[PDB]
Every structure is written in structure tokens, then in C-alpha cells.
Design a protein around this ligand. Structure first.
Ligand SMILES: [Au+]
Lengths: 282, 281
């Protein structure tokens, strides 16, 4: 990992290498005191089109519940991509710490989740560009949800995979995403993944089976409003045609409860200048 | 292995069954009369209910400090005695460090203050050393997390003091001071001292560095001279010469921004029940 740059702007906090921020550098902005992550791609043949793509693509994303691009820098050696860093850890970890959430806390996060997914869809980012199986939390004393988009250790359950995705080579990514969000809601409320047998999580055949046949069962000791239960039943629908849609959720009674109403970087020119300047290696 | 079945279903709402971690294999449930969240450990009626268990529970029940994981109550089941205590829902302090990369000197001081408060208190109660799980402290659910130390239980050799490795007789309280130094360091640096980060399972090399007190605050980590001094005063191989808890309580770094603040169950019920659960259905 390439050495420490712009001491005037950023302080090296810590080099990390095992999250979903990838292998990265953790740095503080000596003005905002803001925490930021910094990825790196050697200068040369790597600085290609699909990169430039990702960078521009990403910058477009501006919704707060997203891990936002900040800036691009040029070193002699590398391309450094600097973005927001969620210092609050994984949402899953908070769940495990809690045992499970109250329906109201689950609703609080789920609102942010839908807001960010909706926004991302409205910029045409479906499915596999979105790490909806491992969402994170910012550092704040009141935690904001933070979704990673484009990554240029952590266990990922197959439970996140929608049945049509299991069964088919082509599908609507947005609908699949809805399924995913269902998984996250469930896990928040139950403290365990649906479909997955908690005692043989590595029995993938069994898991997949239950996904295909939509076999889930809210524990007797878990008690949720009938509205909530309904919403869940409306997401866990095998037929993508019949699965509730994002807007439909945006108007669902459970979703609307206590819903907050809220729900100067670089010239793209100079960005392109630095990408260019970066495609050649001294 | 597997737990007995939800009980006292009128005082407590079952939150979750868990099988590992720091609260071991246990049960999370909620007291409906405080809203507070609790954890439950289970021992099998009869022989296992030994004198160490008696002593451990009694000693546990004795402690009342906001930085210590607190005893709530004990309960009898057909199969098990149920011990109910406070549950730190904020996870491990270490996890928060990793999430942060490292702490600012002020945040590290904020937690370290609580650390010393709780250790000091435990010492005054003659609870040293192995009674404290000082290598794995925890946080409550507070948005502004409170440090929570597990006492009595029912990793990295970094925490072990040179004398604990070498000498036959040692003071557990002084050893504890060393431990607290480790915690401070790791908060500030984001890594354990002594332990080679690229060779964490090299316990030989680690131990070597412990015995020779070989540590090195990274160039990119910048701490006040007061802080650096304190650390130099804790990481002393000779226990005789190591800074003491009271000495720390009066150290300038410690005192900065120091907050000034720094209905149980009857002993009879308790003893009664520990006695009754000596017999196994
Ligand atoms: Au050696």
C-alpha cells in the first residue's frame, strides 16, 4: 500500500485490509475531522474505461444513506480513490449485539434502507452494484445507515438471493433488491436469517430449497404488528411479478409510521484530467 | 450444550438464544418492569453447584459500580439455577477500536477513565486479576457508550505482565495495571503492543517483546507527552517500579476532563436458592 500523501489535508489514521471497504487506507480530514477511506489502483494499464466508469457513475450518487465518493488524487504510483467511511461497523453486528431489534428500531433503519435503494434505482443502479447484504453504520451517536455501491472476513448468506435469481439467468435486478431488503428487515426483527437453518447454515441445499419454496416462520416469541407481518408476506413472494415494489412499500402503512419527511467537489473535467494523467506509469 | 426452556415468562420477555461470544452460551431477555435488557447463564442442578459457584455468585452480587457488569438475580429451575445479570449490548470495546482505526487521545482518555474507576473499585473489594476479564471489556447500548467490565465468568498474551510470566509470587493488582496499559495502547494505536501485527500467532516473539518491554508508538500516531509518559510508567517490567492505580488516579493525563462522579435481591433468597439447586431433578 502506497505511502502517505497530502499531510496538509489528511492524517493517516490506520491502514486496513479486511472489510467491504476492501484493502484501504483510513484517514482523517484535518479540517472536517471527517473519517474517510482511500483505495488505490496502480497507475498504468489498470486505469481503464470500466474504472473511469465506476468513478463517474459513483460520483453521481449523492443520497446521504450511501457511501459517497469524495475525490480523486494522483500519486506517482497509483490512483487513490477517496470516499466516505462508515465508522459504525456493520448493521449485522449491531443486530447480534442487540439479540434483535424492536419493531420501531427495525422500522427506523428500514426507512433509510428503502430511501437509499429507491434513490439508487432512480439512478439505474440495481442489484449487484449494491451491497445490500452487508449494509453499514456511520459513527454518529445516532447511527445512519450506509450502503456501499461499487467496491471497484465477512460471511455472506445465500438467503439474500431471490428465487428467480436462483432459477434464472435473466431477471429484474430492482425486484431482486426488494427481496434482499426483506431479508434485512426479517433479520433485524428476528435476529436470524430467514430460510437459512440456524443450526446447519452450511447446508446450502436446504437453505436454497427453503428460498425456492419461500418457507419462513416468524418465531413465536417474536411479536410484530399485523402491518409489519403483512409487508413481510408481500416481500417474500417467489414470483417477481407479484412481489411488492419499492414505491408500493413507500406507501405501505408500516413504512409510513414515524417516517421523517426528509426522506463543491471536483469538475468532472479535472476528474477526467487526473484519470488520464494516471493511465501512464512512470 | 443446549439450554432449558423459557421461564418466568411474566417478568421477562425472551429476546434471543445465543451460543457463544463473551457472555458465553446464554440467553438474552427483557425485564418488562424496567425495560432493561439482561443476560442469563445456566448451571445444572447438583454437583456442579460447587463452592466456587457459591463464592462466585456471592462475590458477584456484592458489586455495585456503573462500570462493572452487574448481578441482577438468581432463580431456580427444575434443571438449572438461573443467574441473571446486566447485559452490555454495545459489543466489545475492541470492535469499536477496529471500526475507528484508532481513537483520538480524548476518546481513549474518556474510556480509560472509566476503566480505572472500575478497576480501582474492584481492587478495593479485593477482586483482582483473574476475577476481571480486562482483556475483553464491553460497552452498554448508550449512544455515548459506557465501559462495562465482566467480573467472574462461570487470547493475546499482550495483556500478560512480565512478572505473571516469570515470577512465582506476584501481586494481581499490579498485573492489572499492566493490562490496563495494553488497553490504553491499543485504543491509541489500533493495534496491540509487543505483538507483531504481521505475526500475531508468533507467541514466542510476542513474549520476548513483553519480557524486554519492547514497544514502539508509530510515527503517525501523535500523543501528548503526558500520555506518552503515563504509558512509559505502566510498561515497566519490574512490578515494584510500575505506576500504581492511585498514582494513575493522580496523573495529569488521567485528570484532564475527568468527570467528578468518578433494591437488590436478599442475600438469604440467594443462599437459599444456591442451596436448593444443589439437588438434581
Ligand atoms: Au526470540
Amino acid at each position: 500500500l502506497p505511502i502517505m500523501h497530502d499531510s496538509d489535508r489528511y492524517e493517516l489514521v490506520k491502514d486496513i485490509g479486511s472489510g467491504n471497504f476492501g484493502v484501504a487506507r483510513l484517514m482523517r480530514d484535518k479540517q472536517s475531522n471527517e473519517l474517510v477511506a482511500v483505495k488505490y489502483i496502480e497507475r498504468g494499464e489498470k486505469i481503464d474505461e470500466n474504472v473511469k466508469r465506476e468513478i463517474i457513475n459513483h460520483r453521481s450518487l449523492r443520497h446521504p444513506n450511501i457511501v459517497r465518493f469524495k475525490e480523486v488524487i494522483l500519486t506517482p504510483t497509483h490512483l487513490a480513490i477517496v470516499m466516505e467511511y462508515a465508522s459504525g461497523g456493520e448493521l449485522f453486528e449491531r443486530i447480534c449485539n442487540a439479540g434483535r431489534f424492536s419493531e420501531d428500531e427495525a422500522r427506523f433503519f428500514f426507512q433509510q434502507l428503502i430511501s437509499g435503494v429507491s434513490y439508487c434505482h432512480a439512478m439505474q443502479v440495481c442489484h449487484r452494484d449494491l451491497k445490500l447484504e452487508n449494509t453499514l453504520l456511520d459513527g454518529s451517536p445516532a447511527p445512519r445507515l450506509k450502503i456501499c455501491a461499487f467496491g471497484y472476513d465477512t460471511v455472506g448468506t445465500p438467503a439474500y438471493i431471490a428465487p428467480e435469481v436462483l432459477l434464472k439467468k435473466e431477471y429484474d435486478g430492482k425486484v431482486a433488491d426488494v427481496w434482499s431488503c426483506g431479508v434485512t428487515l426479517y433479520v433485524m426483527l428476528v435476529g436470524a436469517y430467514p430460510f437459512e437453518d440456524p443450526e446447519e447454515p452450511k447446508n446450502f441445499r436446504k437453505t436454497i430449497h427453503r428460498i425456492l419454496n419461500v418457507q419462513y416462520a416468524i418465531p413465536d416469541y417474536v411479536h410484530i404488528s399485523p402491518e409489519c407481518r403483512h409487508l413481510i408476506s408481500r416481500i417474500f413472494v417467489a414470483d417477481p411479478a407479484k412481489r411488492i415494489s419499492i414505491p408500493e412499500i413507500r406507501n405501505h402503512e408500516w413504512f409510513l409510521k414515524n417516517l421523517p419527511a426528509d426522506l463543491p467537489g471536483q469538475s468532472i473535467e479535472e476528474i477526467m484530467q487526473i484519470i488520464a494523467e494516471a493511465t501512464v506509469p512512470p
